[PDB]
Amino acid sequence: SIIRPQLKFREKIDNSNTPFLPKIFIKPNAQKPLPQALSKERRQDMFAHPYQYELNHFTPADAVLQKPQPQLYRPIEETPCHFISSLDELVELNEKLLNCQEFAVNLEHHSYRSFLGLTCLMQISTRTEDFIIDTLELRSDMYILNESLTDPAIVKVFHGADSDIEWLQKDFGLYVVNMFDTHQAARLLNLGRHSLDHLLKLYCNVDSNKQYQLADWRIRPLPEEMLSYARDDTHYLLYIYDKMRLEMWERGNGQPVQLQVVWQRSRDICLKKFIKPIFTDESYLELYRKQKKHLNTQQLTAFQLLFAWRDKTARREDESYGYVLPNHMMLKIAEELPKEPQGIIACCNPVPPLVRQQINEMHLLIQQAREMPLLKSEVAA
Ligand SMILES: [Mg+2]
Ligand SMILES: [Y+3]
């Protein structure tokens, strides 16, 4: 099996019901100083977006708003691939990046065995090279990339950056200033589809594999197939960035009007803030109470207790709700109200390890449920 990478982390991941406190402690490329409260030394708002001002007052430079001369992507077999997993190498990559006019970025994430989710890999492409950054190994040093990610002079290209922005801050306190989302461009041009696959075919006649879109990216070592899959998400992003700007340029008859909307739309995505998830048992009964609420006092109580048991276990063990106890099972167990512990198991096909490990604790809960008084209209009906 794969050993949880969280165990080798320097700082225990916090997924309590406390609001999210940005991890950034140093603010490169700043215009508005970082609140003293966030300084590494002490460890004017605080839960506010660290680059709120910089982004609000951000606009792309005229250099990028002019007629684009699309630079073809470098042949894949002629492009060097670098694996970065040490501060030294990360620090050197940031230097190269600080001399680029633009570069591409993408993140591989994992959520099945993690409560909040975990960024596992970060891919970056320049006009000449592809980089694969191991963000499990470099989790605590990733903040350094802020120097180039929040450098308004450099354009960061993403394809559909909504999640990446939230992951970048939630995991490494990283933020982005001056971004161009090709996904946003594709929408603004009203293209057939808006996915990266379409853009890769439409612009580079490249076929995209997807065997790994849902793979387990915590795996180490990462097999060549997965590295190839990972570099393909950024290897062609810069060219597409150019070709899409040419299109907006040719549709604007020669005006940077459609270009600026993309930069504007994209900067709004960079202003999105991460917010810890908050689930309630009320919601997990919408599709249920709206079809057949057979749930009596005893059953509803069992569901409440189980819902709570799952939330606490998931947070404590840093696992996703699905790993701990998927809904359909939690709901079935609440329906059957199994008298014996083995009866709870009979409802799990298969049986999730944490449900077997905590079977007695769960049993005592269902037992409480079975002791609840039934209303008159429930004993008879
Ligand atoms: Mg992506
Ligand atoms: Y409730």
Side-chain angles (χ1 to χ4, degrees), residues 24-39 44-46 48-54:
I24 185 170
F25 51 78
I26 194 171
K27 182 173 187 181
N29 308 291
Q31 301 177 306
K32 176 180 178 183
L34 189 74
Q36 197 194 72
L38 300 180
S39 288
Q44 269 295 293
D45 205 305
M46 182 165 68
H49 188 305
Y51 283 86
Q52 184 64 59
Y53 180 81
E54 353 276 301

Coordinates of all heavy atoms in Angstrom, one line a residue, residues 24-39 44-46 48-54:
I24 N 0.8 32.3 4.4 CA 1.9 33.2 4.0 C 2.5 34.0 5.2 O 1.7 34.5 6.0 CB 1.4 34.1 2.9 CG1 2.6 35.0 2.4 CG2 0.2 35.0 3.4 CD1 2.2 35.8 1.2
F25 N 3.8 34.1 5.3 CA 4.4 34.8 6.3 C 5.4 35.9 5.8 O 5.9 36.7 6.5 CB 5.1 33.8 7.3 CG 6.0 32.8 6.6 CD1 7.3 33.2 6.2 CD2 5.6 31.5 6.4 CE1 8.2 32.3 5.5 CE2 6.5 30.6 5.8 CZ 7.7 31.0 5.3
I26 N 5.6 35.8 4.5 CA 6.5 36.8 3.8 C 5.8 37.1 2.5 O 5.3 36.3 1.8 CB 7.9 36.2 3.6 CG1 8.9 37.3 3.2 CG2 7.9 35.2 2.5 CD1 10.3 36.9 3.2
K27 N 5.8 38.4 2.2 CA 5.1 38.9 1.0 C 5.9 39.6 -0.1 O 6.0 40.8 -0.2 CB 3.9 39.8 1.4 CG 3.1 40.4 0.2 CD 1.9 41.2 0.7 CE 1.0 41.5 -0.5 NZ -0.2 42.3 0.0
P28 N 6.5 38.8 -1.0 CA 7.3 39.4 -2.1 C 6.4 40.1 -3.0 O 5.2 40.0 -3.0 CB 7.9 38.1 -2.8 CG 6.9 37.0 -2.5 CD 6.5 37.3 -1.1
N29 N 7.0 41.0 -3.9 CA 6.3 41.8 -4.8 C 5.1 42.5 -4.2 O 4.0 42.5 -4.8 CB 5.8 40.9 -6.0 CG 6.9 40.1 -6.6 OD1 7.8 40.6 -7.3 ND2 6.8 38.8 -6.4
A30 N 5.3 43.0 -3.0 CA 4.2 43.7 -2.3 C 4.1 45.2 -2.5 O 5.1 45.9 -2.9 CB 4.4 43.5 -0.8
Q31 N 2.9 45.7 -2.4 CA 2.6 47.1 -2.5 C 2.0 47.5 -1.2 O 2.1 48.6 -0.7 CB 1.6 47.3 -3.7 CG 2.2 46.8 -5.0 CD 1.2 46.9 -6.1 OE1 0.0 46.5 -6.1 NE2 1.6 47.6 -7.2
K32 N 1.2 46.6 -0.6 CA 0.5 46.8 0.6 C 1.2 45.8 1.6 O 1.0 44.6 1.4 CB -1.0 46.6 0.5 CG -1.7 46.7 1.8 CD -3.2 46.4 1.6 CE -4.0 46.4 2.9 NZ -5.5 46.1 2.7
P33 N 2.0 46.2 2.6 CA 2.6 45.3 3.5 C 1.7 44.2 4.1 O 0.5 44.4 4.2 CB 3.1 46.2 4.6 CG 3.6 47.4 3.8 CD 2.4 47.6 2.8
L34 N 2.3 43.1 4.4 CA 1.6 42.0 5.0 C 1.3 42.3 6.5 O 2.2 42.7 7.2 CB 2.4 40.7 4.9 CG 1.8 39.3 5.2 CD1 0.8 38.9 4.1 CD2 2.9 38.3 5.3
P35 N 0.1 42.0 7.0 CA -0.2 42.3 8.4 C 0.8 41.6 9.3 O 1.0 40.4 9.2 CB -1.6 41.8 8.5 CG -1.8 40.8 7.4 CD -1.1 41.5 6.3
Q36 N 1.4 42.4 10.3 CA 2.4 41.9 11.2 C 2.0 40.6 11.9 O 2.8 39.8 12.3 CB 2.7 42.9 12.3 CG 4.0 42.6 13.1 CD 4.1 43.4 14.3 OE1 3.4 43.2 15.3 NE2 5.0 44.4 14.3
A37 N 0.7 40.3 12.0 CA 0.2 39.1 12.6 C 0.6 37.9 11.9 O 0.8 36.8 12.4 CB -1.3 39.2 12.7
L38 N 0.8 38.0 10.5 CA 1.1 36.9 9.7 C 2.6 36.6 9.6 O 3.1 35.6 9.1 CB 0.6 37.0 8.3 CG -0.9 37.2 8.1 CD1 -1.3 37.3 6.7 CD2 -1.6 35.9 8.7
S39 N 3.4 37.5 10.2 CA 4.9 37.4 10.2 C 5.3 36.1 10.8 O 4.6 35.6 11.8 CB 5.6 38.6 10.9 OG 5.5 39.7 10.1
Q44 N -6.0 46.7 7.5 CA -5.3 45.8 8.4 C -6.2 44.7 8.9 O -6.7 44.7 10.0 CB -4.7 46.6 9.6 CG -3.3 47.1 9.4 CD -2.3 45.9 9.3 OE1 -2.1 45.2 10.2 NE2 -1.7 45.8 8.1
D45 N -6.3 43.7 8.1 CA -7.2 42.5 8.4 C -6.3 41.3 8.8 O -5.4 41.5 9.6 CB -8.1 42.1 7.2 CG -9.3 41.4 7.6 OD1 -9.2 40.4 8.3 OD2 -10.4 41.8 7.2
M46 N -6.6 40.1 8.3 CA -5.8 39.0 8.6 C -6.3 37.7 7.9 O -5.5 36.9 7.5 CB -5.8 38.7 10.1 CG -5.0 37.6 10.6 SD -4.8 37.7 12.4 CE -6.5 37.4 13.0
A48 N -8.0 38.2 5.3 CA -8.2 38.7 4.0 C -7.2 38.2 3.0 O -6.1 37.7 3.4 CB -8.1 40.3 4.1
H49 N -7.5 38.3 1.7 CA -6.6 37.8 0.7 C -5.3 38.6 0.7 O -5.3 39.8 0.4 CB -7.3 37.9 -0.7 CG -6.6 37.3 -1.8 ND1 -5.2 37.6 -2.1 CD2 -6.9 36.3 -2.7 CE1 -4.8 36.9 -3.1 NE2 -5.8 36.1 -3.5
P50 N -4.2 37.9 1.1 CA -2.9 38.6 1.2 C -2.5 39.5 0.0 O -1.7 40.4 0.2 CB -2.0 37.3 1.3 CG -2.8 36.4 2.1 CD -4.2 36.5 1.4
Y51 N -3.1 39.3 -1.1 CA -2.7 40.1 -2.3 C -3.9 40.9 -2.8 O -4.0 41.2 -4.0 CB -2.1 39.3 -3.4 CG -0.6 39.0 -3.1 CD1 -0.3 37.8 -2.3 CD2 0.4 39.8 -3.6 CE1 1.0 37.5 -2.0 CE2 1.7 39.5 -3.3 CZ 2.1 38.4 -2.5 OH 3.4 38.1 -2.2
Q52 N -4.9 41.1 -1.9 CA -6.1 41.8 -2.3 C -5.9 43.1 -3.1 O -6.4 43.3 -4.2 CB -6.9 42.2 -1.0 CG -8.3 42.8 -1.2 CD -9.2 41.9 -1.9 OE1 -9.5 40.8 -1.4 NE2 -9.8 42.3 -3.0
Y53 N -5.1 44.0 -2.5 CA -4.7 45.3 -3.2 C -4.0 45.1 -4.5 O -4.5 45.6 -5.5 CB -3.9 46.1 -2.2 CG -3.5 47.4 -2.8 CD1 -4.4 48.5 -2.8 CD2 -2.3 47.6 -3.5 CE1 -4.0 49.7 -3.4 CE2 -1.9 48.8 -4.1 CZ -2.8 49.9 -4.0 OH -2.5 51.1 -4.7
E54 N -2.9 44.4 -4.5 CA -2.1 44.1 -5.7 C -2.9 43.7 -6.9 O -2.7 44.2 -8.0 CB -1.0 43.1 -5.4 CG -0.9 42.7 -4.0 CD 0.0 43.6 -3.1 OE1 1.1 43.8 -3.5 OE2 -0.6 44.2 -2.1

